[PDB]
């Protein structure tokens, strides 16, 4: 029933669908109807995909950014398996042919009709790629583990598909009437009002008269801009404050509605409390109408006037110094801005990637200059993904500009889209209207790729406790669910597990304040062994990675950290996945995990960029996902310990040492006996270089032995990223205990140590070349509202860390100075 689906969506998104209807908002109504149709169309297309296309939708290939290997292969309806010897260069089809030939000799009598499932995972190997190009195979080679695969027939894939079925004449100056305000404060009240096009003022800000602290102004506010010159995306921004400065509240609104109609007449603005003008703030009023200060205004009846259609703009806009033009096209002066604008045609024809620079010189407060700009924009060639990411910033607020950026981003691969998904979702917070090209783009890509769809859901769901985005995000999630009834239920199962983990964690938090850790742990186990917990916590797809299946919860192995927020350690097993099904999740409640996730995703991007240049620094890109209000999950890295635990140098252990500096190397020797030691020291060296460069570039501070871990393989990785971008200029960090392992436990080993410096330098030089990508992604991330990513000074930290203004030679000299200073500081 449509009624059952509505109650399921309401529970899933954390907001009743009845709340949307109660708003009596035609913009909400049209978004709902329009996006419902769009997502239902995509669902209809999905249910008729061919079986290979269904594999591409549900299990998109996990590929990496000659040698002999053994692979174990079984068929779906059998316990019997065959271990084959194949090559890393061999394709899945050859492996499937071997499997079918062996089955033919066992059962006594077409490879193209099959796909290879990774046992107990929603992950498949298919396509014309050598086995070593698959992430799963690549992972198996590095850990030494034997790949375990299942031959799955096209009819079984089709069965999965089927079961998952669903104007320019108005020359008068712009003016408003400030009628009256509301709510208490300590002084006089002043309303500051400015017209903005993104971060840029369209004219000077006008302030009304001072009135004593239900204030009544009934004052006319006149602006230094003609009504005809208001750009389509013009924002009227307000700041209510007190004066003897005391900030109280702010509110913004678009001057044109979602139907392009110029707004008239009376508007009640439910204001948001302050941390004066906030142009990047939402243009929707505070939903807490009970307690919020309100400002009533009047938009004079200029008479029904709409913004001119594209056909009108283009009609109007249709109507040796080349040297200095080039030198500034790779902050600028007035004569330089005039050069760019005069030669705008030369920008379009010979420097199309300089569109951003031309957009920034355009006079957005003059309709003639805007029409001239829009005329070139509508015939502008599509730009690279990198250029388009810059155009998504609040610095380019125009709707046509926004639409052009999306058009250039349509060529993003699913892998690239996934890499930038977090930032694209954040950009939604800058959107002026509910129905927009970004939302339609995201929803379309989410419905065409189940992994994208999973993370789009979680990035929206995890901010439902934020009133400024709850309506927009709730509406997007509802549209998504209309497009995928099956995935909605899959996501509901994840939500049921998370609700139980929150209840369990609250119980642990209370109990641990009264009894011992073994007693709270045994009480935790009794709670988990309740039928409703065993059921809710088992048989789900991991919110951290939908390809990871969390099958049977292993209660005996579950525990908690008897410190700070008391995070839970939840272990799982899967008889079908074998050793690969042994996975864990950390549930933590009380900390905002958004910065943690951003830091890990930036490190993961670094790893991708390094790997693209043939550099594998053996990183550990473990998952981190906010799921709710100060709630989220962390993927467990098994067979790892903290540096602090190893450094304790406890007795009656294989790691005990004569000197504390040897504890780490002795631990590595115990985990890697004989010939295996050399591979472990190399794993340590590579990862140490990766994380040294990563933490320096990102300005990750407060690094100690308690937030650095080591895998038994020798790989080093970081945890608990509470601080970044130097928000306590953090220098490069080198640790003597780590120098000791790199140097193979020798006091003097300049051969090994300088090979490590070379890894650092190469890693650093690679990231420098992609400096712009980091800058564009961090600029979009400013929309998130993270306290450590709030201004130009936070972005400046990255420019400085990557030394982007300098030449590669100058940058490497500067890096060598910082590395050498870190070497002297290391004892
Ligand atoms: C019980 C528990 C709940 S939460 C928690 C975290 C950690 C460590 C510090 N952190 C990570 N451990 C593995 N994978 C990760 N992704 C992280 C993180 N972040 C350990 C713990 C202590 C000592 C040795 C091995 C583990 C631990 O027992 N817990």
Curated annotation (Swiss-Prot):
The entry summarizes the disruption phenotype as follows:
Null mutants are viable and fertile but display defective adaptive and innate immune responses due to signaling defects in multiple cell types including B-, T- and mast and natural killer cells.
Q: List the pathway annotation.
A: Phospholipid metabolism; phosphatidylinositol phosphate biosynthesis
Segments forming domain PI3K/PI4K catalytic = 554-827
Q: Which residues carry this modification: Phosphotyrosine?
A: 333
Inhibition and activation profile: Activated by growth factors and cytokine receptors through a tyrosine-kinase-dependent mechanism. Activated by RAS. IC87114 inhibits lipid kinase activity and is selective in cells at doses up to 5-10 uM. Among other effects, IC87114 reduces allergic responses, prevents the recruitment of antigen-specific T cells into target tissue, and affects natural killer cell chemotaxis.
SUPFAM superfamilies attached here? Answer: ARM repeat, C2 domain (Calcium/lipid-binding domain, CaLB), Protein kinase-like (PK-like), Ubiquitin-like
Alphabetized Pfam families for the sequence: PI3_PI4_kinase, PI3K_C2, PI3K_p85B, PI3K_rbd, PI3Ka
Report any one BP term from Gene Ontology: phosphatidylinositol 3-kinase/protein kinase B signal transduction
Where is it found, in Gene Ontology cellular component terms?
A: cytosol
* Boundaries of every C2 PI3K-type domain copy: 170-300
What family is this?
Belongs to the PI3/PI4-kinase family.
This one is known as: Phosphatidylinositol 4,5-bisphosphate 3-kinase catalytic subunit delta isoform
Per the record, the gene is Pik3cd
